[PDB]
A paper describes a structure:
[name] produces a GH29A α-fucosidase, [name], that is ~104-fold more active on α(1-6)-fucosyl linkages compared to other linkages. This enzyme is particularly relevant because α(1-6) linkages form the basis of human core fucosylation, which significantly impacts the function of glycoproteins such as antibodies. [name] is a single-domain enzyme that adopts a (β/α)8 fold typical of GH29 enzymes, with an active site at the center of the barrel. Our results suggest that [name] employs a conserved hydrolytic mechanism with a specific subsite that accommodates GlcNAc in α(1,6)-linkages, while [name] tranfucosidase mutants work by shifting equilibrium between open and closed conformations of an active-site loop.
The mutation of a glutamic acid residue at position 274 to alanine (AlfCE274A) has been shown to convert [name] from a hydrolase into an efficient transfucosidase that can transfer a fucose moiety to an acceptor (e.g., N-acetylglucosamine [GlcNAc]) from a simple fucosyl donor (e.g., α-fucosyl fluoride) with nearly quantitative yields. We solved the X-ray crystal structures of both of these enzymes. They exhibited no major conformational changes compared to AlfCWT, with CαRMSD < 0.25 Å for each of the enzymes. Only AlfCE274A showed a subtle change near the site of mutation, with a displacement of the W198 side chain ~4 Å due to an alternate rotamer conformation in order to occupy the cavity left by [name]. The point mutant AlfCE274A is markedly more dynamic and solvent accessible, particularly in the regions surrounding R229 and D242. These residues interact to mediate open and closed conformations in MD simulations, with these results consistent with AlfCE274A sampling more open conformations. The marked perturbation in R229 provides a potential rationale for the azide rescue seen with AlfCE274A, if azide ions occupy the [name] cavity to stabilize R229 and promote closed conformations. The reaction, monitored by 19F NMR, revealed that only [name] could be rescued by the addition of azide, reaching a reaction speed of about one-third of the wild-type speed. The HDX-MS analysis suggests that AlfCE274A and AlfCN243A are transfucosidase mutants that work by shifting the dynamic equilibrium of [name] toward a more open conformation.
Residue numbers in the entry:
A (entry chain A), D (entry chain A): 2 to 247, 264 to 345
B (entry chain C), C (entry chain C): 2 to 246, 267 to 345
The structure:
């Protein structure tokens, strides 16, 4: 595994947040989403009935994996991570296990994870995946229902509106039927997976944590796994903003990575125009790389599946400043 | 016609700019539209082939004429004007003459002009219409091709990219086949039409100007017609920002937007403050001018959050001031 | 003390953040301050030599206590709290103990705390005070030097740049010579003090905490004291955003800003909408919590245009809702 | 005069808008200025009594000609133009003719035009000047009083509030006593003047127009004069946005220049955060230079005499993109 050595020198990567939440764009019935526009279903407790129907409008005419990767490559990013399934429970790939997915449920009728995976392979970029293994608002036994004693970017961590029976909920049902199967699907198809990013488990047993680890190992041996998953079930540690240099779970390979956004939201949002300046993006990348931390910078694709104009402008301007500085 | 008397005391009205241009939202291939996001097809000379295909994505799940009118009524607006067909040539009604329309060409498969017309009738608001009688970028013989000696919010006034033959163009073909017929359609259906707003003709004969006037008169007698159409072919005059302080009825109206674009746009967040909207309305009404304030509906057919907030805040300030 | 009963029904109050930090306006040598523009001295570790010199530029021509209070009263705010001295150590009153103050050190040469105190009295508003009893970046033995094991809105909690000798620092020197004396000054002059807001002590002994409590009690008996000061040394509790849905009187209050900064800042245009301000006030008042909404005065001592607009628009919506 | 040849290859220049209007910052008594924050005195018809008093607050601690020029030079700008006196009538130099100036009337007590002129000389940049030869709101017989039949960025073109006697006004009084003398002062001192930018005359006789031309010629022979001044009294033509390629006064030397701002205001303004993107600044410069037009890009200094943070960021980012493009 010299995939470890490559990750040491990778430095820069593109993250993609895309789903049904992108269509609403941080706006619901004349009122604003939280800082996080992807959390909008939980924020307004939108019935799966209504939220799911967004799938019927999902027809991103200007989606183009080739261009998205081409941009990423031109900004010097060596890998591309993408959301296979967020908390909303909607898969952005052709899931055999659940028909609540982009291919089956939308007019678009195309596997986005597939196109990106291929585009990356052809452009010579590594391909990473992200999957919400705990939270699933579409699933009756969705995770988080025994972990609401803290506030969120929405309301509850689980779907407490469609399924108001915390006392008679059992995540084991959700894990065996959707989670473990869907993780197999994405790790089986879409060629070589170089990175796998998971959420901090809240309603997940140690068995279920170890299960996923083994599942990824058996299917994608060379795949580097994120620390969020389990304390003895990772390769590289994900540092979360407040864990950045001027408790700490040991990194035995000495691999570190920090996910960040260009504006204040991961999912796309009309009202969020607070785009980090070219200078800020370059300077933060510089700081993280100097402390041996990979910078995973997120683009939130819009309803037509385009990179927001200002997101592109600033990504390219940040590259220019970096290049100009490396000659000076 | 006491429709004249009502227009004198109308004061406030809602304008709706909605079409395929709303889906792009002032953004095309990583580059920004002009101040006017509705002019985006001309701005980037987008082939009718590509631009038209936007119709396939047009599925506004959260469109609701009832609510849009309810908002308008709550802000004190007495009439609602809507775009039947803009310069893009795409009809937002069920046009028998052209299949390039919301009902036939989109998954949505619904007559928006119809729903709004009905919603207005039931809510007790008058219903106005707007139609681009000159410019049509979808039509081979689209107007503006003999009037490019001045700059626009796009490139050329006409579709000079799909149809680059200015020398062998003839608008008479476009007028007889699409324009006059489509004006009949909207003025025939959708109940009583109280106002009709037209563009300044550039490539339109006096005959064609008088034709439309007579067509509207014959179909909608009570309908008040905008001055833009023709010098002896109107009831009320439209003042254009720089004309703010002959109308034989003594009727005047000024169209304005909440931000800087008529059509919806992501990057345009320059929403006029509640205070500005109220103060401008106050000024225009005090000089006997009707304020037609435009909402540019987004891809899901929603009133932009900040557009709603400011419209309602502007009403509050007006109400608070009328008690004080 | 029916000052307790009044605080129960007070509901709305104005907060004022003003000092030398207001002149820089979240900007230093081509680079941005934190979310908190008042913390700018710590953020860039600006020498007291340089930062203090800002006093020479402090000449706010358009400062007017009368108008500031008049605005507050028109928005329905029943009391006005003001910064006597922030972490920067610069007093905004005529301090006999330290010449590092607005009256002595500036061309302005006027006691701002005085004018506001008077303006409030004449307008029929209660007058509150805020004093940084722990942190003082101007003082050699400024507090926070044994509490840097956590991150701030600047760099260190103390002035670690002018005075880099944490090992040979002693806060007792600072407390006896500046803090206790200056607290006496503000609580002695400027008429009746109805509220007193203090910071969470980090480098303050229980003795020093009790000292301040007794000092305020002896000088301003009717004055309600904030919970931040000491666990058995308050009347009302200050809830800090994340504490929103023991107080023996059953009194609670939450401080908030209109944008994301307390001190004024050019680049911070993220003004909470009229709707947001009203709705948050409504929520807090419904849960028996007083809303203390902060205005950060600009270099000329003006209420920022958008701060005023939104405060008045928020009042309008509240009034409109109380009739509806 | 090979000053003509240098102007042909100059391409990029910095403009400085600074005065009493900068202290108000597009804000007066809770209400906003026009697009133009420098026009604020006319906008709210602020008495000379009140407006003039701003001089007492003018103490820009962080003003530094060296740094301003250093920035300009680093962005590749070959000359720096500055406002000696705008419409407000307030001179930013040590005027012997009028005590309504930065040196005499302010705590600052320093000649800004001087420091910049020197800073430019030492850094190896040419030095240009701008003077409002027609409009003067401080002068009783200020110009514009017979030209109010059109709307402005304020109210009237002249000071119609302090001096409401259009019928008994005579500009000849203003020209002989302030204008011609003050133009001599700035063209006599502050070393070599390479460029001189004037306003379109509205209330100025042909004699008075020719007078200024001759005055500049006699004092600064090598100085290139702007077309705005007079039809037979210039070297290079100033194109005003709507005169840019995809009536036209002939340019005999073939010299063209276009003034533009980074945001929508010339003078500094708090509420105007509409900063043209790095991409826009570079692309516009590219377009103008390709059509043989010099790009004069304006910085509006703030109350402390600093280049606004975002103005600097975008100027430097625009340089980076230009440099990156000239290697690619």
């Amino acid at each position: 595994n010299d995939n470890v050595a490559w990750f040491k020198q990778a430095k820069y990567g593109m993250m993609i947040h895309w789903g049904l939440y992108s269509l609403l764009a941080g706006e619901y019935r004349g009122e604003s989403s939280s800082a996080y526009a992807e959390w909008i279903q939980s924020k307004f407790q939108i019935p799966n009935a209504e939220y799911g129907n967004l799938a019927t409008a999902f027809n991103p005419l200007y989606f183009d994996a080739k261009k998205i990767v081409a941009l990423a490559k031109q900004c010097g990013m060596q890998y591309l991570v993408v959301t296979t399934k967020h908390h909303d429970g909607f898969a952005m790939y052709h899931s055999k296990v659940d028909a609540y997915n982009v291919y089956d449920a939308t007019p678009f009728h195309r596997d986005i994870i597939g196109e990106l995976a291929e585009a990356c392979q052809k452009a010579g970029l590594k391909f990473g995946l992200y999957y919400s293994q705990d939270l699933d608002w579409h699933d009756p036994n969705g995770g988080g229902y025994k972990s609401n004693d803290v506030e969120t970017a929405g309301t509850t961590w689980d779907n407490s509106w469609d399924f108001p029976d915390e006392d008679q909920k059992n995540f084991d049902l959700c894990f065996d039927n959707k989670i473990l199967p869907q993780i197999k699907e994405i790790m089986s198809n879409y060629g070589d997976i170089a990175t796998a990013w998971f959420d901090v488990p809240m309603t997940l047993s140690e068995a279920q944590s170890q299960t996923i680890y083994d599942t990824v190992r058996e299917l994608q041996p060379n795949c580097l796994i994120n620390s969020r998953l389990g304390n003895g079930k990772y390769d590289f540690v994900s540092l979360g903003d407040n864990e950045i240099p001027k408790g700490f779970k040991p990194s035995p390979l000495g691999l570190y990575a920090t996910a960040g956004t260009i504006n204040d939201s991961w999912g796309f949002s009309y009202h969020d125009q607070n785009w980090k300046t070219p200078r800020t993006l370059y300077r933060y990348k510089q700081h993280l790389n100097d402390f041996g931390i990979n910078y995973l910078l997120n683009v939130g694709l819009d309803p037509l599946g385009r990179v927001p104009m200002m997101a592109e402008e600033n990504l390219l301007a940040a590259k220019a400043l970096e290049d100009e500085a490396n000659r000076l």
